Write an enzyme that holds these catalytic residues in place. Structure first.
Site, mmCIF file in Angstrom:
data_model
loop_
_atom_site.group_PDB
_atom_site.id
_atom_site.type_symbol
_atom_site.label_atom_id
_atom_site.label_comp_id
_atom_site.label_asym_id
_atom_site.label_seq_id
_atom_site.Cartn_x
_atom_site.Cartn_y
_atom_site.Cartn_z
ATOM 1 N N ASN A 140 -19.656 32.039 -37.359
ATOM 2 C CA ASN A 140 -21.111 32.007 -37.488
ATOM 3 C C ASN A 140 -21.692 33.361 -37.882
ATOM 4 O OD1 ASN A 140 -22.211 29.440 -35.115
ATOM 5 N ND2 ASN A 140 -22.083 29.453 -37.354
ATOM 6 N N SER A 199 -21.162 28.016 -33.137
ATOM 7 C CA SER A 199 -22.288 27.303 -32.541
ATOM 8 C C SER A 199 -23.150 26.496 -33.497
ATOM 9 C CB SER A 199 -23.190 28.295 -31.803
ATOM 10 O OG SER A 199 -24.382 27.672 -31.380
ATOM 11 N N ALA A 223 -33.770 32.499 -31.766
ATOM 12 C CA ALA A 223 -34.999 31.718 -31.823
ATOM 13 C C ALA A 223 -35.449 31.399 -30.399
ATOM 14 C CB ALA A 223 -34.763 30.437 -32.610
ATOM 15 N N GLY A 224 -34.949 32.179 -29.448
ATOM 16 C CA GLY A 224 -35.297 31.961 -28.057
ATOM 17 C C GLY A 224 -34.767 30.615 -27.607
ATOM 18 N N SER A 259 -27.204 33.054 -26.493
ATOM 19 C CA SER A 259 -26.428 34.054 -25.782
ATOM 20 C C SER A 259 -25.759 33.482 -24.538
ATOM 21 C CB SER A 259 -27.320 35.207 -25.367
ATOM 22 O OG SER A 259 -26.985 35.600 -24.060
ATOM 23 N N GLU A 303 -24.801 38.143 -19.308
ATOM 24 C CA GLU A 303 -26.225 38.095 -19.622
ATOM 25 C C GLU A 303 -26.922 39.361 -19.153
ATOM 26 O OE1 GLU A 303 -27.391 36.650 -21.806
ATOM 27 O OE2 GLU A 303 -28.055 34.591 -21.481
ATOM 28 N N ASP A 317 -31.461 30.531 -18.719
ATOM 29 C CA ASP A 317 -30.611 30.178 -19.841
ATOM 30 C C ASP A 317 -29.208 29.790 -19.420
ATOM 31 O OD1 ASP A 317 -32.219 32.818 -21.849
ATOM 32 O OD2 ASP A 317 -32.931 30.878 -21.093
#
Length: 390
Positions: free
Chosen positions: A54, A130, A136-137, A141, A188, A199
């Site tokens: 990606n 992915s 793009a929020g 991650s 994270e 998330d």
């Protein structure tokens, strides 16, 4: 029965709550079934290598060279000393792309943290691709950090492989998932200073999560809803967007306060309907759902976090009997549209096409899907492992 590991985890999107939570309100975070995959395989060759098609980057390490280090410097595990030493181990060429510098340091940190208790550093070929639009929020991650977690726990046997039976997919037990969670959350922190943990929780547990004042809670099982993720490709500054609402609140307290309270009521109501829905999703339930989306969207507009693109997203969809609402910081970014059962597939396609004939990205997915899982390296789409092979 297989040494080779194939794990996936979903990204996340906010169904209701966007800017209220920052003010003590209730947000509803759902999993976005635009899944991320990780292919893990043990090698005889003393080398650990990471492949992320990606992004088009590939790095490797001499297991021998890694084992050497007194990697004993491994709660607030994210240390300036640690992150520092880790970069040394890293090997990220001086001037290096921000995106992959974080992609690698999160891997190394985790590899060495779990494979740590292993009598010897395993040699494995890692590859992660992915379906999740990057930056793009959407939580790409933590989907990542969750996969590198589950996979590494399974290898080192700190956690059992749930596939052990003979299915195509399967999920760890409640206890293991918690371990998977605590770990991902770590990477994270290794990357995003002080993340909330919404998330990773979403990527781990899937389905629906409730977020209040610092605490997170899963929602009583409610089926996954078919949506339409729409990216307006319109850039935006989340930090600024959040300040515009803080300032607008100071200026107009007697006005905004209530507004927040109406958004709050929206999450509350959605939560209710989702639940009661769990059983038999009756038309009234969807109605009510489309109904809440409209109000939330307009409320978000009253907060001054909407945008021309979104108004267009909402208009093109509404003309067809579908409802949409921005998700995230607003001011551009992505949106959400709800597809209820019944609508003719083509007309769902046409709507999809109209949004695209605007210079918009529009993928048809589902929200509130499974969550971190493992698969038999023979299921899924072919364009998937091909991207994880070629």
């Amino acid at each position: 029965l297989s040494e080779v590991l194939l794990v996936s985890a979903p990204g996340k999107v906010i169904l209701h709550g966007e800017h209220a939570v920052v003010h003590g309100k209730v947000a509803l975070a759902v999993s976005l079934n635009l899944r991320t995959f990780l292919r893990l395989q043990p090698h005889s060759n003393g080398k650990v290598d990471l492949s992320l098609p990606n992004i088009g980057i590939k790095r490797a390490w001499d297991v021998a060279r890694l084992q050497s280090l007194d990697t004993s410097f491994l709660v607030t595990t994210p240390t300036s000393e640690q992150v520092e030493k880790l970069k040394e181990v890293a090997g990220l060429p001086d001037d290096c792309a921000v995106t992959e510098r974080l992609a690698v340091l999160a891997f190394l940190y985790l590899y060495l943290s779990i494979c740590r208790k292993q009598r010897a550093l395993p040699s494995l070929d890692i590859v992660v691709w992915s379906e999740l639009p990057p930056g793009a929020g959407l939580g790409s991650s933590a989907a990542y950090s969750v996969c590198l977690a589950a996979a590494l726990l399974t290898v080192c046997e700190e956690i059992p492989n749930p596939l052990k039976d003979g299915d195509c997919v399967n999920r760890w037990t409640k206890e293991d998932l918690e371990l998977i969670n605590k770990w991902a959350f770590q990477g994270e922190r290794m990357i995003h200073g002080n993340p909330s943990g919404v998330d990773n929780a979403v990527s781990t547990w899937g389905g629906a999560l409730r977020y209040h004042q610092g605490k997170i809670s899963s929602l009583k099982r409610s089926p996954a809803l078919q949506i339409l993720l729409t990216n307006t490709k319109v850039p935006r500054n989340t930090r600024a967007l959040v300040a515009g609402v803080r300032n607008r609140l100071l200026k107009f307290p007697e006005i905004v306060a209530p507004l927040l309270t109406s958004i709050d009521a929206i999450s509350l109501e959605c939560e209710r309907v989702l639940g009661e829905m769990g059983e038999a999703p009756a038309p009234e339930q969807y109605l009510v759902l489309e109904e809440l989306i409209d109000m939330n969207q307009h409320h978000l507009n009253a907060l001054g976090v909407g945008h021309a693109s979104l108004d267009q997203l909402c208009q093109v969809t509404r003309a067809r009997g579908l409802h949409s609402k921005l998700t995230g910081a607003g001011g551009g970014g992505c949106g959400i549209t709800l597809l209820k059962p019944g609508l003719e597939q083509p007309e769902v396609e046409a709507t999809k096409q109209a949004l695209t004939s605007c210079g918009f990205d529009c993928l048809e997915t589902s929200i509130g899907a499974p969550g971190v899982s493992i698969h038999s390296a023979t299921s899924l789409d072919s364009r998937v492992q091909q991207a994880l092979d070629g």
